[PDB]
Design an enzyme around this catalytic site. Structure first.
Site, PDB file in Angstrom:
ATOM      1  N   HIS A 222       0.855  -1.185   0.000  1.00 26.32           N
ATOM      2  CA  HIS A 222       0.000   0.000   0.000  1.00 26.32           C
ATOM      3  C   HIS A 222       0.895   1.241   0.000  1.00 26.32           C
ATOM      4  O   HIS A 222       2.107   1.115   0.009  1.00 26.32           O
ATOM      5  CB  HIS A 222      -0.976   0.027   1.173  1.00 26.32           C
ATOM      6  CG  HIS A 222      -0.315   0.233   2.492  1.00 26.32           C
ATOM      7  ND1 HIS A 222       0.894  -0.340   2.809  1.00 26.32           N
ATOM      8  CD2 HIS A 222      -0.697   0.953   3.575  1.00 26.32           C
ATOM      9  CE1 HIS A 222       1.225   0.009   4.044  1.00 26.32           C
ATOM     10  NE2 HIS A 222       0.279   0.793   4.525  1.00 26.32           N
TER      11      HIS A 222
ATOM     12  N   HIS B  18       1.577   3.854   2.079  1.00 26.85           N
ATOM     13  CA  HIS B  18       2.318   4.396   3.226  1.00 26.85           C
ATOM     14  C   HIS B  18       3.807   4.115   3.120  1.00 26.85           C
ATOM     15  O   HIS B  18       4.218   3.130   2.515  1.00 26.85           O
ATOM     16  CB  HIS B  18       1.778   3.806   4.550  1.00 26.85           C
ATOM     17  CG  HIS B  18       0.440   4.336   4.944  1.00 26.85           C
ATOM     18  ND1 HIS B  18      -0.397   3.690   5.834  1.00 26.85           N
ATOM     19  CD2 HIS B  18      -0.201   5.478   4.581  1.00 26.85           C
ATOM     20  CE1 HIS B  18      -1.504   4.399   5.982  1.00 26.85           C
ATOM     21  NE2 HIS B  18      -1.406   5.488   5.234  1.00 26.85           N
TER      22      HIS B  18
ATOM     23  N   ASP C  91       5.968   2.930   5.048  1.00 28.38           N
ATOM     24  CA  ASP C  91       6.534   1.688   5.577  1.00 28.38           C
ATOM     25  C   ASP C  91       6.456   0.542   4.549  1.00 28.38           C
ATOM     26  O   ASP C  91       7.022  -0.528   4.770  1.00 28.38           O
ATOM     27  CB  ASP C  91       5.910   1.288   6.950  1.00 28.38           C
ATOM     28  CG  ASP C  91       4.392   1.001   6.923  1.00 28.38           C
ATOM     29  OD1 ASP C  91       3.651   1.474   6.051  1.00 28.38           O
ATOM     30  OD2 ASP C  91       3.923   0.331   7.883  1.00 28.38           O
TER      31      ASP C  91
ATOM     32  N   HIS D 271      -7.302  -0.968   6.276  1.00 33.62           N
ATOM     33  CA  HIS D 271      -6.268  -0.062   6.774  1.00 33.62           C
ATOM     34  C   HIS D 271      -6.076   1.175   5.875  1.00 33.62           C
ATOM     35  O   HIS D 271      -5.874   2.290   6.356  1.00 33.62           O
ATOM     36  CB  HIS D 271      -4.954  -0.830   6.898  1.00 33.62           C
ATOM     37  CG  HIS D 271      -3.764   0.045   7.162  1.00 33.62           C
ATOM     38  ND1 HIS D 271      -3.565   0.683   8.369  1.00 33.62           N
ATOM     39  CD2 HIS D 271      -2.720   0.384   6.377  1.00 33.62           C
ATOM     40  CE1 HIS D 271      -2.442   1.376   8.314  1.00 33.62           C
ATOM     41  NE2 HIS D 271      -1.908   1.214   7.115  1.00 33.62           N
TER      42      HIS D 271
ATOM     43  N   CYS E 296      -0.217  -4.169   6.380  1.00 36.46           N
ATOM     44  CA  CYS E 296      -0.802  -3.414   7.479  1.00 36.46           C
ATOM     45  C   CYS E 296      -2.311  -3.644   7.609  1.00 36.46           C
ATOM     46  O   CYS E 296      -2.950  -3.094   8.503  1.00 36.46           O
ATOM     47  CB  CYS E 296      -0.484  -1.928   7.309  1.00 36.46           C
ATOM     48  SG  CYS E 296       1.299  -1.614   7.168  1.00 36.46           S
TER      49      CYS E 296
ATOM     50  N   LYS F 252      -4.246  -7.005  11.484  1.00 36.48           N
ATOM     51  CA  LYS F 252      -4.144  -6.254  12.728  1.00 36.48           C
ATOM     52  C   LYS F 252      -4.818  -7.058  13.856  1.00 36.48           C
ATOM     53  O   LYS F 252      -5.954  -6.780  14.250  1.00 36.48           O
ATOM     54  CB  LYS F 252      -4.792  -4.876  12.557  1.00 36.48           C
ATOM     55  CG  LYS F 252      -3.997  -3.888  11.696  1.00 36.48           C
ATOM     56  CD  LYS F 252      -2.781  -3.356  12.472  1.00 36.48           C
ATOM     57  CE  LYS F 252      -1.810  -2.624  11.550  1.00 36.48           C
ATOM     58  NZ  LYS F 252      -2.473  -1.464  10.888  1.00 36.48           N
TER      59      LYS F 252
ATOM     60  N   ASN G 251      -2.925   2.780  13.110  1.00 40.67           N
ATOM     61  CA  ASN G 251      -3.235   4.120  12.644  1.00 40.67           C
ATOM     62  C   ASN G 251      -4.459   4.124  11.728  1.00 40.67           C
ATOM     63  O   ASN G 251      -4.437   3.522  10.644  1.00 40.67           O
ATOM     64  CB  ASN G 251      -2.043   4.731  11.923  1.00 40.67           C
ATOM     65  CG  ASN G 251      -2.151   6.239  11.818  1.00 40.67           C
ATOM     66  OD1 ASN G 251      -3.249   6.787  11.748  1.00 40.67           O
ATOM     67  ND2 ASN G 251      -1.009   6.916  11.787  1.00 40.67           N
TER      68      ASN G 251
ATOM     69  N   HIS H 219       3.137  -5.323  11.466  1.00 39.31           N
ATOM     70  CA  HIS H 219       3.582  -4.791  12.750  1.00 39.31           C
ATOM     71  C   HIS H 219       3.413  -5.699  13.960  1.00 39.31           C
ATOM     72  O   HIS H 219       3.730  -5.289  15.073  1.00 39.31           O
ATOM     73  CB  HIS H 219       2.864  -3.477  13.037  1.00 39.31           C
ATOM     74  CG  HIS H 219       3.057  -2.451  11.965  1.00 39.31           C
ATOM     75  ND1 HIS H 219       4.299  -1.962  11.621  1.00 39.31           N
ATOM     76  CD2 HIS H 219       2.172  -1.827  11.156  1.00 39.31           C
ATOM     77  CE1 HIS H 219       4.165  -1.065  10.660  1.00 39.31           C
ATOM     78  NE2 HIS H 219       2.883  -0.959  10.370  1.00 39.31           N
TER      79      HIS H 219
END
Ligand SMILES: O=C(O)c1cccc(CP(=O)(O)O)n1
Ligand SMILES: [Zn+2]
Ligand SMILES: [Zn+2]
Length: 218
Positions: free
Chosen positions: A75, A77, A79, A137, A156, A159, A165, A195
């Site tokens: 995606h 972002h 990271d 996300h 991400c 989860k 976030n 994460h």
């Protein structure tokens, strides 16, 4: 002083790379991606946060005899995409979905050199598949499936103990997207989140429960 990039074997031809960044309101955030080996060729599943760690990652595999054939970012972002500019500068092909590239472009960030559009895409046919479960996300988040190994990189989107976030999240859509992901990959041996630690298919269930829970608080 953030911890160093780490690279560890997850399975035959599959490595987990973990990089670290200080993100406001979160602290030091670990980020997992994959490196997948197909014969003598390596594919990056997400880049580390930074150019520096992306270079380290690439150097580690090239020094062991693997040519970097490309990267895919799950995606928009940083990271997942922080390394794209550096990879582009080395003429290593970078891939992202059409939507992801659009969001990068909108944010004035470097885009992947290759894009794909549609629910399913073979990055490497019969070895590395990309799947879009729907918004969660982020609007653009995709997962990567390794059919030979039954390994799902969830990025991400996965989860299991909290949604993280929510700034770009679609909380309305996430329970349905999670439902689809769970149905498609209930057969997964391993599920790799961005994460939290690698787990088994139960992470799909837990994500679904966390998504439903997050939606409940209206
Ligand atoms: O929910 C997440 O995925 C999450 C949370 C904090 C931090 C990050 C990393 P970035 O700041 O690049 O989004 N991700
Ligand atoms: Zn994200
Ligand atoms: Zn993240």
């Amino acid at each position: 002083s953030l911890p160093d990039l780490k690279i560890e074997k997850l399975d035959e031809g599959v490595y987990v790379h973990t990089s670290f960044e200080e993100v406001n309101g979160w602290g030091v955030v670990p980020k997992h991606g994959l490196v997948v080996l197909v014969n003598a060729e390596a594919y990056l599943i997400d880049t580390p946060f930074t150019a520096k760690d992306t270079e380290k990652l690439v150097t580690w595999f090239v020094e062991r005899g693997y040519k970097i054939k490309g990267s895919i970012s799950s995606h928009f972002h940083s990271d997942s995409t922080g390394g794209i500019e550096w990879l582009n500068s080395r003429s290593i092909p970078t891939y992202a979905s059409e939507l992801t590239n659009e969001l990068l472009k909108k944010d004035g960030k470097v885009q992947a050199t290759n894009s794909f559009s549609g629910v399913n895409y073979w990055l490497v046919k019969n070895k590395i598949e990309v799947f879009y479960p729907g918004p969660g996300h982020t609007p653009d988040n995709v997962v990567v499936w390794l059919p030979e190994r039954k390994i799902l990189f969830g990025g991400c989107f996965i989860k299991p103990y909290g949604l993280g976030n929510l700034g770009d999240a679609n909380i309305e859509a996430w329970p349905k997207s999670a439902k689809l992901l769970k149905s498609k990959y209930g057969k997964a041996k391993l599920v790799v989140p961005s994460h939290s630690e690698v787990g088994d298919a139960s992470l799909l269930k837990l994500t679904l429960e966390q998504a439903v829970k997050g939606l409940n608080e209206s």
